[PDB]
Amino acid sequence: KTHVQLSLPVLQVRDVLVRGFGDSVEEVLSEARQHLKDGTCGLVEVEKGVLPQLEQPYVFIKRSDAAPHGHVMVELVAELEGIQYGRSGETLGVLVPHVGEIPVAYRKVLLRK
């Protein structure tokens, strides 16, 4: 299927134990997609102070359309040293590995795969 419905655990930034997916733009998009498929991907909502507490390259989910069954359609965009790889809409948050942290909420999305 070209899209998959997921419900992503929303994590507080200071609880995150593994603060990024890897060391290159290509690796972090790859690992983010793998973790989404395996159900081991969390979401950190971006506010002042958040991104400097996480590791670059970043992987964002961004809105890709103006929302079936409650799930916002999203796509992945990576960022490294101020340059983004991908072009999309408003950021819904930054993706990180989930390794058991307790979430504050869940965010329903329809992920373009």
Short mmCIF file of C-alpha atoms in Angstrom, two decimals:
data_model
loop_
_atom_site.label_atom_id
_atom_site.label_comp_id
_atom_site.label_asym_id
_atom_site.label_seq_id
_atom_site.Cartn_x
_atom_site.Cartn_y
_atom_site.Cartn_z
CA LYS A 1 0.00 0.00 0.00
CA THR A 2 1.22 3.54 -0.74
CA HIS A 3 0.04 4.81 2.67
CA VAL A 4 -0.17 3.20 6.09
CA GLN A 5 -2.19 4.31 9.12
CA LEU A 6 -0.07 4.59 12.24
CA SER A 7 -0.57 5.95 15.74
CA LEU A 8 2.70 7.36 16.95
CA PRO A 9 3.60 7.76 20.64
CA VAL A 10 4.37 11.38 21.48
CA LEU A 11 7.41 11.62 23.75
CA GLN A 12 8.75 14.42 25.92
CA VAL A 13 12.22 15.41 24.69
CA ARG A 14 13.96 14.95 28.06
CA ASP A 15 12.71 11.35 28.27
CA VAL A 16 14.17 10.26 24.90
CA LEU A 17 17.00 7.79 25.32
CA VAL A 18 18.09 7.43 21.65
CA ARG A 19 18.12 10.93 20.28
CA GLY A 20 18.34 10.29 16.49
CA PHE A 21 18.43 7.57 13.86
CA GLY A 22 22.01 7.81 12.57
CA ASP A 23 24.75 9.81 11.00
CA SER A 24 23.75 10.66 7.42
CA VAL A 25 20.63 11.95 5.69
CA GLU A 26 20.21 8.69 3.79
CA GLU A 27 20.65 6.57 6.94
CA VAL A 28 18.24 8.51 9.12
CA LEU A 29 15.44 8.36 6.51
CA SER A 30 16.10 4.63 6.07
CA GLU A 31 16.09 3.87 9.79
CA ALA A 32 13.07 6.10 10.41
CA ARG A 33 11.10 4.19 7.77
CA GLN A 34 12.22 0.86 9.25
CA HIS A 35 11.22 1.90 12.78
CA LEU A 36 7.81 3.14 11.54
CA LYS A 37 7.21 -0.25 9.92
CA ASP A 38 8.33 -2.14 13.09
CA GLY A 39 6.23 0.03 15.42
CA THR A 40 9.30 1.34 17.24
CA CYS A 41 9.14 5.03 16.25
CA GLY A 42 8.22 7.93 18.52
CA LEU A 43 7.36 11.58 17.83
CA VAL A 44 8.63 14.72 19.62
CA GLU A 45 6.65 17.89 19.12
CA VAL A 46 8.91 20.75 18.12
CA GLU A 47 9.08 23.78 20.37
CA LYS A 48 11.81 26.23 21.35
CA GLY A 49 14.65 24.31 22.94
CA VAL A 50 13.74 20.92 21.49
CA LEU A 51 15.91 20.48 18.45
CA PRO A 52 19.25 21.37 20.11
CA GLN A 53 18.53 18.53 22.56
CA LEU A 54 18.30 16.02 19.68
CA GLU A 55 20.93 14.69 17.27
CA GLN A 56 21.30 15.70 13.65
CA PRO A 57 20.46 14.72 11.00
CA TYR A 58 16.83 15.16 12.00
CA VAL A 59 13.85 13.38 10.50
CA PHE A 60 10.58 15.37 10.44
CA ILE A 61 7.04 14.31 9.59
CA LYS A 62 5.36 17.07 7.63
CA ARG A 63 1.78 17.45 6.44
CA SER A 64 1.40 16.45 2.80
CA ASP A 65 -2.25 17.48 2.11
CA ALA A 66 -5.27 19.43 3.40
CA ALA A 67 -7.27 13.97 6.67
CA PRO A 68 -8.89 10.55 6.22
CA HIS A 69 -10.42 8.68 9.20
CA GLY A 70 -8.72 11.07 11.66
CA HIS A 71 -5.19 10.41 10.33
CA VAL A 72 -3.21 13.33 8.90
CA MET A 73 -1.38 12.49 5.67
CA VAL A 74 2.36 12.96 6.22
CA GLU A 75 5.70 12.48 4.53
CA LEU A 76 9.29 12.36 5.74
CA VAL A 77 11.84 15.17 5.37
CA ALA A 78 15.40 15.08 6.71
CA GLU A 79 17.51 18.07 7.79
CA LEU A 80 21.27 18.48 8.24
CA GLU A 81 23.12 21.73 8.89
CA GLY A 82 20.16 23.86 7.85
CA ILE A 83 19.44 22.07 4.55
CA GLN A 84 16.32 19.93 4.06
CA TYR A 85 16.00 16.88 1.84
CA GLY A 86 12.41 16.71 0.79
CA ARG A 87 9.85 19.48 0.42
CA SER A 88 6.51 19.30 2.27
CA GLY A 89 4.10 21.16 4.56
CA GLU A 90 3.96 22.12 8.22
CA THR A 91 6.00 20.01 10.65
CA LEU A 92 4.04 17.70 12.95
CA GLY A 93 7.16 16.80 14.93
CA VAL A 94 10.56 15.15 14.87
CA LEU A 95 10.89 11.36 14.76
CA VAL A 96 13.07 9.37 17.16
CA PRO A 97 13.48 5.74 18.08
CA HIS A 98 11.05 4.49 20.71
CA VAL A 99 12.61 2.14 23.23
CA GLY A 100 9.88 2.01 25.91
CA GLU A 101 9.53 5.62 27.02
CA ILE A 102 6.07 6.52 28.34
CA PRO A 103 4.14 8.78 25.94
CA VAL A 104 2.04 11.84 26.74
CA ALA A 105 -0.30 11.34 23.76
CA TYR A 106 -0.69 9.52 20.48
CA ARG A 107 -0.69 11.17 17.05
CA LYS A 108 -2.64 9.45 14.27
CA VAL A 109 -1.03 9.79 10.84
CA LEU A 110 -1.32 8.38 7.34
CA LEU A 111 2.27 7.84 6.26
CA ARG A 112 3.26 8.04 2.62
CA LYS A 113 5.53 5.04 2.18
#
